[PDB]
Amino acid sequence: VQGKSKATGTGLVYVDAFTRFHCLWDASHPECPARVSTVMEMLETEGLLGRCVQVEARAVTEDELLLVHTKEYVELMKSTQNMTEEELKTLAEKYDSVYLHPGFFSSACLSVGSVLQLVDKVMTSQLRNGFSINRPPGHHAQADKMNGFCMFNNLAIAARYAQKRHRVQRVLIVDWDVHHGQGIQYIFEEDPSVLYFSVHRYEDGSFWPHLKESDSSSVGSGAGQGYNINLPWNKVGMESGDYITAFQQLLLPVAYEFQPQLVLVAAGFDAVIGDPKGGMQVSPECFSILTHMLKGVAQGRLVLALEGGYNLQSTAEGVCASMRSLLGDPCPHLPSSGAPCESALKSISKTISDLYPFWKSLQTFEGGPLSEVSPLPAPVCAEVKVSSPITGLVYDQRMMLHHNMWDSHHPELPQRISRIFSRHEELRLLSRCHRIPARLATEEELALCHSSKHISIIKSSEHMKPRDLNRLGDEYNSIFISNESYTCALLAAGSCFNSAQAILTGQVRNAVAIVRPPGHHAEKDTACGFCFFNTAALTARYAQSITRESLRVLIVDWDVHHGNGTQHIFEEDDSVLYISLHRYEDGAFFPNSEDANYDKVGLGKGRGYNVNIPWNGGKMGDPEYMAAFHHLVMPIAREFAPELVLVSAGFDAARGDPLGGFQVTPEGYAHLTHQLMSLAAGRVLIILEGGYNLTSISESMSMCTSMLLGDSPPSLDHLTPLKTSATVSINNVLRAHAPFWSSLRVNIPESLRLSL
Ligand SMILES: CCCCN(Cc1ccc(C(=O)NO)cc1)C(=O)Nc1ccccc1
Ligand SMILES: [Cl-]
Numbered sequence: 001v002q003g004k005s006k007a008t009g010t011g012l013v014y015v016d017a018f019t020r021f022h023c024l025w026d027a028s029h030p031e032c033p034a035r036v037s038t039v040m041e042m043l044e045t046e047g048l049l050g051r052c053v054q055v056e057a058r059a060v061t062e063d064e065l066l067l068v069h070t071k072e073y074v075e076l077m078k079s080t081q082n083m084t085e086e087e088l089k090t091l092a093e094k095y096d097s098v099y100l101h102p103g104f105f106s107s108a109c110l111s112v113g114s115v116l117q118l119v120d121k122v123m124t125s126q127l128r129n130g131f132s133i134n135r136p137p138g139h140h141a142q143a144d145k146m147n148g149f150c151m152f153n154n155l156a157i158a159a160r161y162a163q164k165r166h167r168v169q170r171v172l173i174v175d176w177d178v179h180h181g182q183g184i185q186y187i188f189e190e191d192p193s194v195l196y197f198s199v200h201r202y203e204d205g206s207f208w209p210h211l212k213e214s215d216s217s218s219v220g221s222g223a224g225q226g227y228n229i230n231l232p233w234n235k236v237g238m239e240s241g242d243y244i245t246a247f248q249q250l251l252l253p254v255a256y257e258f259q260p261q262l263v264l265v266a267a268g269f270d271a272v273i274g275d276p277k278g279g280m281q282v283s284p285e286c287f288s289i290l291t292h293m294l295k296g297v298a299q300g301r302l303v304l305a306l307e308g309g310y311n312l313q314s315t316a317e318g319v320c321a322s323m324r325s326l327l328g329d330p331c332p333h334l335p336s337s338g339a340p341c342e343s344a345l346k347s348i349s350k351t352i353s354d355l356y357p358f359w360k361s362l363q364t365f366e367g368g369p370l371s372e373v374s375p376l377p378a379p380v381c382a383e384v385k386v387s388s389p390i391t392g393l394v395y396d397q398r399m400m401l402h403h404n405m406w407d408s409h410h411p412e413l414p415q416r417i418s419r420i421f422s423r424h425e426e427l428r429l430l431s432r433c434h435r436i437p438a439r440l441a442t443e444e445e446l447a448l449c450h451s452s453k454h455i456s457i458i459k460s461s462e463h464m465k466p467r468d469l470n471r472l473g474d475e476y477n478s479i480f481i482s483n484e485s486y487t488c489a490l491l492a493a494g495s496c497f498n499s500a501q502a503i504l505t506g507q508v509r510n511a512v513a514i515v516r517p518p519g520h521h522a523e524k525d526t527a528c529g530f531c532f533f534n535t536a537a538l539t540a541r542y543a544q545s546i547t548r549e550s551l552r553v554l555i556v557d558w559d560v561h562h563g564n565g566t567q568h569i570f571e572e573d574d575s576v577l578y579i580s581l582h583r584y585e586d587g588a589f590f591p592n593s594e595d596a597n598y599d600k601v602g603l604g605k606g607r608g609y610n611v612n613i614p615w616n617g618g619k620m621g622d623p624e625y626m627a628a629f630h631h632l633v634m635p636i637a638r639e640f641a642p643e644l645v646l647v648s649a650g651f652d653a654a655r656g657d658p659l660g661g662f663q664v665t666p667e668g669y670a671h672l673t674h675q676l677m678s679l680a681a682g683r684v685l686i687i688l689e690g691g692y693n694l695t696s697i698s699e700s701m702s703m704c705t706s707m708l709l710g711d712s713p714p715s716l717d718h719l720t721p722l723k724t725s726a727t728v729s730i731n732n733v734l735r736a737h738a739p740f741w742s743s744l745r746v747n748i749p750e751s752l753r754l755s756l
């Protein structure tokens with residue numbers, strides 16, 4: 001309703017104070033000033049620094065420190081300011097892996113303050129997110145002691161400060177640093193207002209600080225029981241897939257259930273390739289994906305503070321990759337496979353199992369065994385130049401000329417598109433988009449999927465008299481035709497081709513297609529369910545045509561009906577992946593086929609490249625559509641590695657639909673579009689299929705375009721609990737597809753057999 005006031009813009013805190021302290025006894029200490037100065041050099045070299053709002057650093061106050069620390073500790077730390085090298089060494093010796101400096105106090109104060117300054121701007125809707133390039137780090141510091149190069153616990157102090165001075169209820173702290181932030185774990189052990197997550201290297205205590213508490217078994221005590229999550233890696237050399245799958249199957253479900261009003265990140269880059277202490281092999285590009293994922297929960301309220309990362313290049317690279325996500329730039333192509341390794345899956349599963357009682361979101365999994373067979377190939381896509389994102393928009397009023405001369409009360413109304421378009425202009429989304437001109441799809445182009453018999457039969461209709469047009473329409477299941485119905489289905493496909501062209505030639509990064517008549521029901525030789533040509537399927541082959549025959553295309557169908565037309569066109573094709581969320585009702589719901597079931601996994605060389613998530617018994621909404629994305633849609637999509645993502649966007653699955661009978665809010669469609677934007681380097685094309693409530697479609701589709709333009713994900717309702725008829729529908733797809741995609745394999749025991 002107001003856009004000049006909208007909070008956009010990333011704050012960045014950096015002060016020379018951060019370089020003023022170092023180790024006096026060891027000239028080669030990993031925690032040094034070059035860590036932060038290098039990050040700054042690169043941020044400028046990349047052009048990222050100038051794109052950040054400059055936020056001033058402030059010193060932390062004694063009372064702010066005392067929200068987590070003791071007065072005895074604070075005063076001792078304060079006293080270090082006026083101590084001899086010797087006095088400092090003697091005190092430093094008293095703690096695990098710590099050095100001290102005359103100037104260490106000053107910098108540690110500014111290192112805390114800097115985070116609070118960002119919390120201020122984010123919480124008061126001034127900036128959307130922020131990142132401090134601060135040292136000394138925080139996550140290891142405890143109430144009464146220094147530890148692992150930390151003096152004060154920056155993010156712990158910030159979590160409390162948020163709750164106190166900004167009256168924030170729930171705070172999520174994500175620690176992707178390669179070390180376990182025990183200092184944080186401790187502070188919020190018994191606090192259930194602060195949920196703390198920590199993926200770290202462990203190898204059964206062999207890796208520093210060698211704590212028993214760093215295991216997944218340690219889930220927090222008292223009131224805070226289940227609000228402490230440890231993901232310990234017990235094998236080195238973890239990659240992108242190992243962190244993405246962890247976030248998908250474990251952290252995102254937990255985070256969406258917990259509903260925080262703020263997300264704090266202990267952004268350590270010691271897991272990046274080339275870090276001497278981490279021993280991990282995560283490419284920096286991965287952090288672009290993780291940062292994006294966290295934008296969903298806490299509705300954009302995201303603050304990152306620098307923790308570890310001891311290789312000057314690797315850290316600067318990691319910071320840049322995270323900074324790009326905050327600044328709203330498109331995600332990169334993943335430089336490694338989207339598949340996890342067995343040791344990762346074992347660590348993820350043992351953590352899901354260790355937290356199963358406390359989280360209704362994790363309770364989704366029934367338990368038992370999912371396949372461990374050699375999975376399908378998990379390829380990598382060629383790097384695409386990260387550029388200023390542009391959202392394309394295509395609409396032509398000529399697509400309204402297709403109508404029913406008999407039943408004027410037919411749900412596929414011409415108004416559907418003009419209404420969606422109106423809302424796009426009212427909300428000003430249209431003026432923020434790049435207008436792509438609609439065109440007519442050629443017969444050669446229609447040939448890509450459809451028979452010459454089916455093409456000529458619909459082509460001919462541009463001349464038929466109305467009685468011939470009533471007769472012709474009864475020759476099909478649910479089809480109505482008119483003298484313009486052919487030109488309309490030609491524009492619907494033509495437009496979508498011009499979008500995919502813009503996207504692939506880098507003219508735009510993503511686009512939206514307000515088109516009618518729909519297409520996901522149309523087959524090689526027959527029209528069906530208001531569809532003439534499979535507009536999504538033809539786009540996929542037009543894309544494969546302008547690139548290379550092998551171009552991997554993902555087709556996500558969120559329309560309430562299963563896209564029978566799509567499913568069959570690519571049933572044998574391994575280059576195109578088709579995922580469909582639909583009301584099945586054991587075969588009762590349209591197009592009444594058993595093809596829409598979880599046991600149909602594609603056939604031939606396309607075995608595993610076809611996913612169906614069938615809905616039985618209930619009004620499925622956001623809780624069920626989201627959990628399907630976390631556990632199934634996103635893990636499969638990621639392992640497949642698409643180069644183009646196509647949405648068969650039907651809002652007939654929305655709350656208020658006459659034909660759907662499902663309760664998916666417009667805010668829910670926003671979060672589904674958001675999730676999909678981390679794939680294909682953000683190369684997402686949104687195509688209108690179903691949706692029959694003029695109001696519900698205009699609102700829900702505008703929400704998608706808002707997400708494409710990089711606006712913060714909206715506030716959601718409650719996502720736990722979900723229909724027991726859905727929990728069972730999900731676990732069916734998991735079992736059906738686990739032999740093909742390693743990202744699914746959450747082999748957990750019989751924790752289900754407990755509580756009711
Ligand atoms: C035996 C057919 C039952 C399903 N259908 C047709 C249908 C076809 C496609 C879609 C769709 O969502 N297309 O994208 C929805 C319903 C209908 O119920 N359609 C309908 C037609 C006129 C008036 C009221 C309803
Ligand atoms: Cl050991």
Ligand SMILES: [Cl-]
Nearest residue numbers: 363364365366
């Ligand atoms: Cl279950």
Ligand SMILES: [K+]
Nearest residue numbers: 177179199200
């Ligand atoms: K960690």
Ligand SMILES: [K+]
Nearest residue numbers: 188191224227
């Ligand atoms: K806690």
Ligand SMILES: [K+]
Nearest residue numbers: 177179268308
């Ligand atoms: K660290």
Ligand SMILES: [K+]
Nearest residue numbers: 557559561581
């Ligand atoms: K569907």
Ligand SMILES: [K+]
Nearest residue numbers: 570573606609
């Ligand atoms: K397939």
Ligand SMILES: [Zn+2]
Nearest residue numbers: 559561652690
């Ligand atoms: Zn539909």
